[PDB]
Write an enzyme that holds these catalytic residues in place. Structure first.
Site, PDB file in Angstrom:
ATOM      1  N   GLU A 146       9.330  -2.888   0.578  1.00  0.00           N
ATOM      2  CA  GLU A 146      10.010  -1.629   0.938  1.00  0.00           C
ATOM      3  C   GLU A 146      10.140  -1.498   2.451  1.00  0.00           C
ATOM      4  O   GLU A 146       9.177  -1.158   3.162  1.00  0.00           O
ATOM      5  CB  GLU A 146       9.286  -0.415   0.350  1.00  0.00           C
ATOM      6  CG  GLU A 146       9.282  -0.340  -1.171  1.00  0.00           C
ATOM      7  CD  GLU A 146       8.492   0.857  -1.715  1.00  0.00           C
ATOM      8  OE1 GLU A 146       7.644   1.447  -0.971  1.00  0.00           O
ATOM      9  OE2 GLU A 146       8.694   1.163  -2.923  1.00  0.00           O
ATOM     10  N   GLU A 287       9.785  -2.232  -9.151  1.00  0.00           N
ATOM     11  CA  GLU A 287       8.730  -1.279  -9.447  1.00  0.00           C
ATOM     12  C   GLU A 287       9.308   0.024 -10.072  1.00  0.00           C
ATOM     13  O   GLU A 287      10.391   0.522  -9.691  1.00  0.00           O
ATOM     14  CB  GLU A 287       7.891  -0.955  -8.184  1.00  0.00           C
ATOM     15  CG  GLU A 287       7.435  -2.146  -7.365  1.00  0.00           C
ATOM     16  CD  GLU A 287       6.734  -1.711  -6.067  1.00  0.00           C
ATOM     17  OE1 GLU A 287       6.710  -0.487  -5.845  1.00  0.00           O
ATOM     18  OE2 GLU A 287       6.240  -2.580  -5.284  1.00  0.00           O
TER      19      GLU A 287
HETATM   20  O1  LIG Z   1      -3.914  -0.873   5.984  1.00  0.00           O
HETATM   21  C1  LIG Z   1      -3.582  -0.426   4.693  1.00  0.00           C
HETATM   22  C2  LIG Z   1      -3.259   1.065   4.795  1.00  0.00           C
HETATM   23  O2  LIG Z   1      -2.435   1.473   3.721  1.00  0.00           O
HETATM   24  C3  LIG Z   1      -1.875   2.762   3.924  1.00  0.00           C
HETATM   25  O3  LIG Z   1      -0.974   3.161   2.881  1.00  0.00           O
HETATM   26  C4  LIG Z   1       0.121   2.286   2.689  1.00  0.00           C
HETATM   27  C5  LIG Z   1      -0.145   1.347   1.524  1.00  0.00           C
HETATM   28  O4  LIG Z   1      -0.501   2.092   0.322  1.00  0.00           O
HETATM   29  C6  LIG Z   1      -1.348   1.372  -0.556  1.00  0.00           C
HETATM   30  C7  LIG Z   1      -1.096   1.919  -1.960  1.00  0.00           C
HETATM   31  O5  LIG Z   1      -0.048   1.210  -2.609  1.00  0.00           O
HETATM   32  C8  LIG Z   1       0.338   1.817  -3.815  1.00  0.00           C
HETATM   33  O6  LIG Z   1       1.364   1.105  -4.503  1.00  0.00           O
HETATM   34  C9  LIG Z   1       2.603   1.299  -3.857  1.00  0.00           C
HETATM   35  C10 LIG Z   1       3.273  -0.076  -3.624  1.00  0.00           C
HETATM   36  O7  LIG Z   1       2.552  -0.821  -2.683  1.00  0.00           O
HETATM   37  C11 LIG Z   1       4.705   0.076  -3.125  1.00  0.00           C
HETATM   38  O8  LIG Z   1       5.357  -1.180  -3.085  1.00  0.00           O
HETATM   39  C12 LIG Z   1       5.365   1.028  -4.105  1.00  0.00           C
HETATM   40  O9  LIG Z   1       6.760   1.089  -3.975  1.00  0.00           O
HETATM   41  O10 LIG Z   1       4.744   2.283  -3.931  1.00  0.00           O
HETATM   42  C13 LIG Z   1       3.536   2.210  -4.680  1.00  0.00           C
HETATM   43  C14 LIG Z   1       3.022   3.614  -5.051  1.00  0.00           C
HETATM   44  O11 LIG Z   1       2.647   4.352  -3.897  1.00  0.00           O
HETATM   45  C15 LIG Z   1      -0.831   1.809  -4.791  1.00  0.00           C
HETATM   46  O12 LIG Z   1      -0.495   2.418  -6.014  1.00  0.00           O
HETATM   47  C16 LIG Z   1      -1.999   2.544  -4.187  1.00  0.00           C
HETATM   48  O13 LIG Z   1      -3.004   2.457  -5.175  1.00  0.00           O
HETATM   49  C17 LIG Z   1      -2.363   1.935  -2.827  1.00  0.00           C
HETATM   50  O14 LIG Z   1      -3.273   2.803  -2.186  1.00  0.00           O
HETATM   51  C18 LIG Z   1      -4.516   2.219  -1.878  1.00  0.00           C
HETATM   52  O15 LIG Z   1      -5.354   2.336  -2.986  1.00  0.00           O
HETATM   53  C19 LIG Z   1      -6.601   1.710  -2.816  1.00  0.00           C
HETATM   54  C20 LIG Z   1      -7.396   1.850  -4.107  1.00  0.00           C
HETATM   55  O16 LIG Z   1      -7.680   3.202  -4.359  1.00  0.00           O
HETATM   56  C21 LIG Z   1      -7.705   3.576  -5.760  1.00  0.00           C
HETATM   57  O17 LIG Z   1      -8.504   2.768  -6.514  1.00  0.00           O
HETATM   58  C22 LIG Z   1      -9.879   2.720  -6.115  1.00  0.00           C
HETATM   59  C23 LIG Z   1     -10.493   4.132  -6.094  1.00  0.00           C
HETATM   60  O18 LIG Z   1     -11.788   4.142  -5.518  1.00  0.00           O
HETATM   61  C24 LIG Z   1      -9.585   5.056  -5.298  1.00  0.00           C
HETATM   62  O19 LIG Z   1     -10.119   6.354  -5.271  1.00  0.00           O
HETATM   63  C25 LIG Z   1      -8.183   5.013  -5.906  1.00  0.00           C
HETATM   64  O20 LIG Z   1      -7.371   5.955  -5.233  1.00  0.00           O
HETATM   65  C26 LIG Z   1      -7.333   2.213  -1.554  1.00  0.00           C
HETATM   66  O21 LIG Z   1      -8.399   1.318  -1.318  1.00  0.00           O
HETATM   67  C27 LIG Z   1      -9.634   1.982  -1.046  1.00  0.00           C
HETATM   68  O22 LIG Z   1      -9.746   2.314   0.320  1.00  0.00           O
HETATM   69  C28 LIG Z   1     -10.799   3.236   0.483  1.00  0.00           C
HETATM   70  C29 LIG Z   1     -10.598   4.011   1.785  1.00  0.00           C
HETATM   71  O23 LIG Z   1     -10.056   3.144   2.765  1.00  0.00           O
HETATM   72  C30 LIG Z   1     -12.086   2.407   0.410  1.00  0.00           C
HETATM   73  O24 LIG Z   1     -13.214   3.254   0.542  1.00  0.00           O
HETATM   74  C31 LIG Z   1     -12.154   1.597  -0.906  1.00  0.00           C
HETATM   75  O25 LIG Z   1     -13.022   0.489  -0.754  1.00  0.00           O
HETATM   76  C32 LIG Z   1     -10.801   1.085  -1.440  1.00  0.00           C
HETATM   77  O26 LIG Z   1     -10.815   1.021  -2.847  1.00  0.00           O
HETATM   78  C33 LIG Z   1      -6.399   2.213  -0.326  1.00  0.00           C
HETATM   79  O27 LIG Z   1      -6.988   2.805   0.806  1.00  0.00           O
HETATM   80  C34 LIG Z   1      -5.110   2.929  -0.658  1.00  0.00           C
HETATM   81  O28 LIG Z   1      -4.219   2.885   0.443  1.00  0.00           O
HETATM   82  O29 LIG Z   1       0.934   0.545   1.336  1.00  0.00           O
HETATM   83  C35 LIG Z   1       2.082   1.242   0.864  1.00  0.00           C
HETATM   84  C36 LIG Z   1       2.508   2.305   1.887  1.00  0.00           C
HETATM   85  O30 LIG Z   1       3.392   3.235   1.317  1.00  0.00           O
HETATM   86  C37 LIG Z   1       1.316   3.147   2.305  1.00  0.00           C
HETATM   87  O31 LIG Z   1       1.716   4.023   3.335  1.00  0.00           O
HETATM   88  C38 LIG Z   1      -2.956   3.848   4.073  1.00  0.00           C
HETATM   89  O32 LIG Z   1      -2.348   5.050   4.516  1.00  0.00           O
HETATM   90  C39 LIG Z   1      -4.043   3.414   5.060  1.00  0.00           C
HETATM   91  O33 LIG Z   1      -5.162   4.287   5.025  1.00  0.00           O
HETATM   92  C40 LIG Z   1      -4.496   1.966   4.804  1.00  0.00           C
HETATM   93  O34 LIG Z   1      -5.182   1.874   3.563  1.00  0.00           O
END
Ligand SMILES: OC[C@H]1O[C@@H](O[C@H]2[C@@H](OC[C@H]3O[C@@H](O[C@H]4[C@H](O)[C@@H](O)[C@H](O)O[C@@H]4CO)[C@H](O)[C@@H](O)[C@@H]3O[C@@H]3O[C@H](CO[C@H]4OC[C@@H](O)[C@H](O)[C@H]4O)[C@@H](O[C@@H]4O[C@H](CO)[C@@H](O)[C@H](O)[C@H]4O)[C@H](O)[C@H]3O)OC[C@@H](O)[C@@H]2O)[C@H](O)[C@@H](O)[C@H]1O
Length: 359
Positions: A146, A287
């Site tokens: 994206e 997606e």
């Molecule tokens: O440096 C990375 C940075 O990422 C930033 O956000 C960007 C990032 O989002 C990630 C999310 O992607 C989602 O899927 C998307 C997909 O990639 C796209 O292609 C699509 O078109 O859109 C989709 C839908 O949005 C995906 O669904 C999300 O799940 C993912 O978010 C990350 O999730 C993980 C896991 O969390 C979940 O499972 C575990 C549970 O414990 C948790 O409560 C659930 O919510 C997160 O990992 C966790 O991180 C925490 C805190 O850092 C740790 O404590 C832990 O160990 C770990 O499990 C993760 O943080 C979260 O981002 O890419 C897509 C872009 O749109 C986003 O802007 C964030 O803002 C930054 O903080 C950083 O993470």
């Protein structure tokens, strides 16, 4: 068709794109290390293609070579094998790298250093394409994920030109690494994988494929077009309990989405058919999906299945490939259909809705 063979897709989400502090790490976002039994289970559920988000980020060495950690390419190749050796279609992309919001993200259309971005992109794709050169047509390369400036309105034209440039570099770079790369399907998006900004007159251009079969030219297309679909956001992505129902079978106004219903879905997928499918470009909806809101409304899974059925069936109607977004999270606002820890199905109804849609 390539489209019928691909059937319905499933995303191996929150794995090889997962990264912390700029370093890709498939266990960093709550999922276990990928194993072949997971991919065998997804195939058993009826899925015929797998999409594999991959991030590169700090695993890319310095300029001018931008060498990708050997261990990282070797890992990606193991994961791709899990799917490819099962007879599935497999899509690999560049995922986290294209985001302003991902730490270490560098493939930025709003970057001031475009000549530097494009050189890194070319060299990165060169190495990925070299690594995968002997894989057949069942392996698809997706140029990026994206890609946008972090702004949700009208796309900046100069920035769209940059995005168009990356698509063109990707195509020509891959073609020049030679067979099976000269012939393989290459998947490219428009602005923020957004249908409106991809079909409208906002700046999207189709890449030429001049380096393919350059001495016995053309002219049949080996390019596909990407878009993602999560509309209406209120139902599909907003992390709260305001909106938990969707579509014609919902008769609860206090909880039903306020746009993006069946009519809107039709017109959206109709526009991708009209613009691309009819021109010989297959279309991949890379997606789609809705987050788990059963913690707010005990009827939500009914509407998650209805949404997935409608989206899959509409894609089927317009000859595009629907690919479900599964991030492995089973829980509040989760997207998962499987428990990856115990290798079990957790959303059989949604899987059922997808398979019904594919009929
Ligand atoms: O440096 C990375 C940075 O990422 C930033 O956000 C960007 C990032 O989002 C990630 C999310 O992607 C989602 O899927 C998307 C997909 O990639 C796209 O292609 C699509 O078109 O859109 C989709 C839908 O949005 C995906 O669904 C999300 O799940 C993912 O978010 C990350 O999730 C993980 C896991 O969390 C979940 O499972 C575990 C549970 O414990 C948790 O409560 C659930 O919510 C997160 O990992 C966790 O991180 C925490 C805190 O850092 C740790 O404590 C832990 O160990 C770990 O499990 C993760 O943080 C979260 O981002 O890419 C897509 C872009 O749109 C986003 O802007 C964030 O803002 C930054 O903080 C950083 O993470």
């Amino acid at each position: 068709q390539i489209v019928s063979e691909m059937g319905a897709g499933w995303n191996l989400g929150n794995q090889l794109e997962a990264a912390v502090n700029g370093t890709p790490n498939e266990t960093a976002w709550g999922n276990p290390t990928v194993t072949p039994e997971l991919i065998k289970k997804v195939k058993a559920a009826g899925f015929k293609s797998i999409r594999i988000p991959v991030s590169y980020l700090n695993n890319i060495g310095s300029a001018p070579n931008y060498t990708i950690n050997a261990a990282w390419l070797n890992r990606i190749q193991q994961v791709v094998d899990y799917a490819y050796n099962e007879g599935l279609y497999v899509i690999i992309n560049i995922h986290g790298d294209g985001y302003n919001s991902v730490q270490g993200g560098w493939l930025l259309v709003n970057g001031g250093n475009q000549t530097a971005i494009k050189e890194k992109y070319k060299k990165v794709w060169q190495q990925i394409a070299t690594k995968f050169s002997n894989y057949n047509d069942r392996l698809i390369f997706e140029s990026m994920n994206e890609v946008f400036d972090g702004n949700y309105g009208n796309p900046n034209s100069a920035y769209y030109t940059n995005l168009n440039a990356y698509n063109q570099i990707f195509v020509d770079t891959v073609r020049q690494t030679g067979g099976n790369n000269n012939a393989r399907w290459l998947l490219v998006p428009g602005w923020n994988t957004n249908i409106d900004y991809t079909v409208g007159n906002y700046g999207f251009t189709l890449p030429t494929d001049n380096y393919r079969s350059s001495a016995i030219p053309s002219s049949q297309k080996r390019i596909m077009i990407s878009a993602h679909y999560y509309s209406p956001w209120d139902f599909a992505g907003e992390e709260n309990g305001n909106i938990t129902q969707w579509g014609a079978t919902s008769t609860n106004p206090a909880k039903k989405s306020t746009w993006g219903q069946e009519d809107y879905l039709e017109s959206q997928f109709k526009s991708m058919y009209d613009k691309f499918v009819t021109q010989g470009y297959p279309v991949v909806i890379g997606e789609f999906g809705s987050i788990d809101k059963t913690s707010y409304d005990s009827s939500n899974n009914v509407y998650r299945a209805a949404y997935a059925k409608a989206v899959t069936a509409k894609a089927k109607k317009y000859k595009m490939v629907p690919v479900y977004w599964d991030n492995g999270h089973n829980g509040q606002h989760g997207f998962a259909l499987f428990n990856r820890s115990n290798n079990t199905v957790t959303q059989q109804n949604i899987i059922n809705a997808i398979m019904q849609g594919m009929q």
